[PDB]
Amino acid sequence: THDLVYHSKINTFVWDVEFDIVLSDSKELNKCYFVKCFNPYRINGKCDFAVSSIDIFSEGKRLLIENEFNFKITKAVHVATSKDVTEIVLHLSERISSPFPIVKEVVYLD
Amino acid sequence: DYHFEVNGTVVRHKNKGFGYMERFFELKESCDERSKLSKKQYERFNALFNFFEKNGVICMAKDAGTLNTSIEINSLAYHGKYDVMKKFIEEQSVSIEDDYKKAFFLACLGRWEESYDLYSNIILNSIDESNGCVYYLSQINRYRIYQSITQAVTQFNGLGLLTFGRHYKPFTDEFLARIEREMTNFNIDDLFNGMPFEFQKKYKILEFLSDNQFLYDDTVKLFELTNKVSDIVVLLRLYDNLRFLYENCLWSVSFHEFHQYIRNSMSLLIEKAEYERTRDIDELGFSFFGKKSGFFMEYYDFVNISRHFKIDDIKNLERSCSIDKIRFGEQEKIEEYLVGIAEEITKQFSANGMNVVFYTQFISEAKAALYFAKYVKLSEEGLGKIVKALLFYFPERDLDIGKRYVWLERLTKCNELPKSIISIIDDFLVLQAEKHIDQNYSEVSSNGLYSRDYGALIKHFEKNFISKRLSEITLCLTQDKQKQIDFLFKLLPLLSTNAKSHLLSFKSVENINDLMNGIRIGLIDEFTPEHEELIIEYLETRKVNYIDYMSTFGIWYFLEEINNSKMEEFIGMDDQYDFFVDPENFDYKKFIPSWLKNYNDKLLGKIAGNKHMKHHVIEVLKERVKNSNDKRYLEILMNYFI
Amino acid sequence: KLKEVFLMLDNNVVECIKEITESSRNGKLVFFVGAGVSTLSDYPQWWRLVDKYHEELYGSPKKGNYSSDEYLRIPQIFYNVKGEMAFDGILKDFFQVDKPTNPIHDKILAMNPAHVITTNYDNLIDTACWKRGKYFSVISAEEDVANATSSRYLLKVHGDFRKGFKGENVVLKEDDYLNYDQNYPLISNLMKTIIATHTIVFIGYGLGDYNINMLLNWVRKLQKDSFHKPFFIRTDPSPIENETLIYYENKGLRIIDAASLIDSNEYDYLERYSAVMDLLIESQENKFITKDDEVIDYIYGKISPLFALQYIRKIDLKHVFEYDYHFEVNGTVVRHKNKGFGYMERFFELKESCDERSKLSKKQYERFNALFNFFEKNGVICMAKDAGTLNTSIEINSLAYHGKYDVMKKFIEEQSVSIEDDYKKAFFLACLGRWEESYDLYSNIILNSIDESNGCVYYLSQINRYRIYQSITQAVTQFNGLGLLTFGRHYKPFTDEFLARIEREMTNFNIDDLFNGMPFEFQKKYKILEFLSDNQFLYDDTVKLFELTNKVRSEMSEGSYSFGMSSDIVVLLRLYDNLRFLYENCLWSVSFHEFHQYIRNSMSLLIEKAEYERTRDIDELGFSFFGKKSGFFMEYYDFVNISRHFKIDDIKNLERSC
């Protein structure tokens, strides 16, 4: 739990951690992770408001299509270095009000 | 006995004997004193005059009226003249010093095996039948090349196999064994002591090279951050320490000790100059006395920044200080150097380019150069060649598609986009489309950006650019090439009207999930009534569930691109929805500041432009920033709400 | 396989091999190459030359075997009767065939000998010296001795054909063998002094050569303890039989034989030499397998000199062990380049096991106790992988840091006891500003510190007095200029006679040359004290401070709060490590301009980072409720550091940003 760093200008916790995924539809995904991209200088010509280009990797190579906003839950989540951190992830998932509270490697393209 | 100041002159100190230097400098100007000198010794005076004017010692301190030293480097390696060094290496060597610089150049092109062999040849042929300077230098360079080979082989064949798939073993195993055997227990500390006693008295100034750390000048660098309210004695020493190592063909210019203080001098100098500015403004005035920052980057400054800095270090430079206030001198020379880098990249990938050590040594400076290029006004042809190289011949193992797009957006900030650059980007998009015909090929990016941003940038710079090639590719589409249709969906604005008409029939809109898929890929621009009715049923479904995308619908309504009024009947639930649909009757006690951290420039501009929420939002932000040190809330407050 | 081959070695061989390696690493090993290394690959020997002398002289081939005297009598007879021309022609015909070098010569030169002495007239060793890239002044005739070009001597005792293939240039006949001291006095004296003052290892000789017997007879007239017994690398294909070994060991030859080491054939000279050479070389990179007795012995051999020193910082302990182990500042140790026995790991495990200590030697328990007391005071705890709750307390057990002027004044007024008390008194005197008396105290310490063989006190006193000379010169220059107008009275600090005296005795000092002029054992044991002469000792922790500054600022701009270890603990534990080293040992340059700025920069960074961490923008919980436990508790030492190494401008800038 020494690799978790909270970022301020975007409500996110960076942590090299993989979480199993359960969404509203029956399709289920194994341990995966998110990558957020804070870009306030992004081309938003259309009705785009988000400053974060948030996407998902399944196994570091499998980027799944966004499609609908799946109602994902953290389920069992592993740091892949020390031990399972399920509580340590779910406890700070709330009181954030930002989608994908815990991601890995925010790119911070300014 | 004499303090040779780096600014150009010399000052006296501890010369208990006669003042030979003062008399020499006095006779430098008087022609009669020159004439009265003896004939056999006159040529020696001429040689001394040539040496002293070359090294940059002008005059004494009592008459040092002119002291501006224009640094000049004539080394071929500094300017990255690879085409010249290759031709020189192909040319046979006539002497030993020419052989020495051939060895050094061979070391800078990554061919370390040939460089080591040629250094061994020099050692054999110049054992002691000279002044010994070449023998000493070629012993040190040999050891440094051996260290570099060991470090590369412990890393390239150690862990970096995935950087080229399978072990490329750039150095042969027999060669590795030979260099290990020939260099068992080579004492580098005592090497200078093994030289003849005459050498140790004459070339005493070459002692530091045989040391584990020799550049203990960093302790002097602590004078750059003293807050007493110059710095030119450090920059001149940096050039003084670069014209030695890079012009005497020495193999101590690629290690981490050299790169560490160059990354420390060039950072401390710019930071202190940034502190000289923004501090004189406090008591002198913004523009009445704020002429310039003080620092002036030149060709030999940009080259150092390119060669030694990394991307994270450059970003740290940009975050701390505003480099945009620092003008880049000698724009033409920077343009030519960048064009040379682009030519080298183009020639490297197009050819075999299997040689990997030089690739790794040179890709860093190439990336740093094309990163810093945004500060230099590049010529039209030069920019065209730069962009062509960066798009079609830069390896994808180092620069991903997202980083590639970031690089161009960085380059287009300080320069427009004439027809040539947009034509190059159009050709790149065409190449991507032709690559997408393979249904098993997918883009990999570590920045979130993709090929959509290229079309978006083209449209932003040119509102009516219709890529006829893309239109023809769309016309020639089939049903089974689903991935191609998706990719062309991502670039809808760049297609022609008949192309759009043919494409839209392939994939229509469905319910809300596909609706939002089309919105993300920009399928629809004006919200058609059918889309509007589809929206309501989702909200009507939400009411049943309540008795998500709701924030998106509220924001769209706030942006006035949704003109439906019956949705006004559906308020009193989510905070953001009511905020963006009915600011009149919102009770503001439920507002959360975190929302403001997800809004781009235009949304905050529209929020600030509205009267009914400006005061509430600004007082919320002030309350939040009073009790916290968050820079994001203050940044939002000052950029848009003042 | 070779690792256990080193084990199947007699204790005499075990100690001889380590002695040779120690001499080689000490630059004291002088090789003695003889006939047998040359004839290894293809070089012709003297027997065939004597055969052709018999042919040209006696008509018929030699019958039977010629005796030892005939080896020199037959060529002498040929020279006396037929003359010099035919002799020179025969030598020219024989000795012109160039032969390639052999790996044994490369192995010999790979041990970095201080000198090599050979009786070979060939240039095989000479060419191997040139081709490998190692310089040697060739001394073969008398005139070369006067014209020596360097300090390394490739001595050709019997001469060579470098000036021409002539009989005079080489000692081959009986006349020049008998009249050797009357023809080659200088080279003989040089050989004798090299053998006396260095370590000699004979290779190639076989106890049946005139040179070996002459040297052994020369040894008999060298008292008892005035000479070292040279080593002997015998490579005959027969066991030493253990009686001639006794005879030659009594006469002064510690024989090492290759027949016992390896089971080679009778025509395996190459393998016979190569076994011993590889065994010697492989022992130059590592020591033998260790036990509880030797590990503590090795550590005490590498740490005992540091005992005289009051305190030693942790970063340079890698130099003590020569980059074998990376000593982390937090008190942990990690493996960096120790490609051998893990002595530090075993030391720490034996530290953490009382039962493993009961099997120690008699007094080695006391040595380990001393090492434990030393390491406990130095803050090192355990290995890097095994470390937890490493909280440590910062303490300075000195008086200059605490600013107790009256206390150290009273201490100065008290009587002296030893050299250490005088040293600390001189440092206190310099701190009080009475530099005039401090210089005299340091001079007296220098004078009285050489009668006792310590070195540390003398070296540190010289450094301190040189820095005091710098300080008083700076004070004088300030006073006679700006200081003359800052205050009314000029206030002449020191007498003109004293200034003239210090100027006379300070000229041509060459401070950086002080360590080079130090005795070899002093610079070997105190490798870390070289950094005190120059400003290298701040480079190690300045390069890693300018890099943590950018790292912390990057997080400042990025706004990434961390919930784990703070990056400002490496600098914090380096502040009170360099400060403790500089103050506890009572060195000067605690008021050095460069050292003050490093402290100021580190303090400024610490306060910036701590004030940033104080106002966290966290509205959520930490690990469970909160991660941080405390902040920047400005201790007494922190206040002293801020008060002593800051100016008004620096504190003002710090206030206007925190």
Residue numbers in the entry:
A (entry chain C): 11 to 120
B (entry chain B): 337 to 565, 580 to 897, 911 to 1005
C (entry chain A): 14 to 671
From the study:
Defense-associated sirtuin 2 (DSR2) systems are widely distributed across prokaryotic genomes, providing robust protection against phage infection. DSR2 recognizes phage tail tube proteins and induces abortive infection by depleting intracellular NAD+, a process that is counteracted by another phage-encoded protein, DSR Anti Defense 1 (DSAD1). Each DSR2 protomer consists of a conserved N-terminal Sirtuin (SIR2) domain, a C-terminal domain (CTD) and a middle domain (MD). DSR2 assembles into an elongated tetramer, with four NADase catalytic modules clustered in the center and the regulatory-sensing modules distributed at four distal corners.
Here, we collected high-quality cryo-EM data to generate a three-dimensional map of the DSR2-DSAD1 complex with a nominal resolution of 3.49 Å, providing detailed information on the complex architecture and functional insights. The structure shows that DSAD1 binds directly to the CTD of DSR2 at the site typically used for Tube binding and activation of DSR2. Structure and sequence alignments show that the inhibitory DSR2-DSAD1 complex cannot bind to the phage tube protein due to a steric clash between two proteins at the binding interface. Our results demonstrate that DSAD1 competes with Tube for the binding site of DSR2, resulting in the inhibition of DSR2 activation by Tube. The DSAD1 protein and DSR2 assemble in a 2:4 ratio, forming an inhibited state. Each X-shaped DSR2 dimer interacts with one DSAD1 protein. The interactions between DSR2 and DSAD1 are mainly contributed by hydrophobic interactions (F59 of DSAD1 to I918/W919/L922/Y962/L966 of DSR2(a)) and further strengthened by hydrogen bonds (S107/S108 of DSAD1 to S957/N961 of DSR2(a)). There is also an additional hydrophobic interaction between DSAD1 and the opposite DSR2 (L14/V15/Y16 of DSAD1 to F576/Y574 of DSR2(b)). Furthermore, the DSR2-DSAD1 tetramer in the inhibited state shows a structure similar to the “loose” conformation observed in the inactive apo DSR2 tetramer. In contrast, binding of the inhibitor DSAD1 to DSR2 induced minor conformational changes in DSR2.
